[PDB]
Write a protein that binds this ligand. Sequence first.
Ligand code: HEM
Length: 137
Amino acid sequence: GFKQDIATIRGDLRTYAQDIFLAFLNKYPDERRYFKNYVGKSDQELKSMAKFGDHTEKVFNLMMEVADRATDCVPLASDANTLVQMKQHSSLTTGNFEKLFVALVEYMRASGQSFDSQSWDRFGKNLVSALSSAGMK
Ligand code: HEM
């Protein structure tokens, strides 16, 4: 289930973080505009860039923290608040987040693995609701 998925992802966080992030950019290529240093770079070039792996892992580490603190896939309002208030997220809308979770769920469904993909979808929906309430447009 969802708790196991957090363990699966954490077990190999660098790989999963990079592969899910690339799945997101692949499905929604216009989203790459938010990451100015990754424009025009192949996947292998990206993986050779210190901050690509480091920062992408940090994104997913926080995601796993928020996921683990949730109850029945309902995130803490304080965690939603953190995400809204981050300077790096100042121009984002909840739609950016829903796209990430759509790509993440698609990735899970296509993987050779028994992720609780329905739960990740529901967590994404609940997170979008919480982001909206905390002030994200
Ligand atoms: C629940 C989902 C998300 C979480 C937990 C999260 C978390 C984080 C964290 C921890 C950082 C700091 C990375 C660092 O400087 O090392 C970050 C940066 C950033 N995030 Fe988010 N993020 C999420 C979703 C998104 C989405 C959907 C977008 C846009 C499509 C986005 C855009 C950015 C950008 C542009 C940065 C700065 C990139 C950098 O300095 O390398 N994030 N995020």
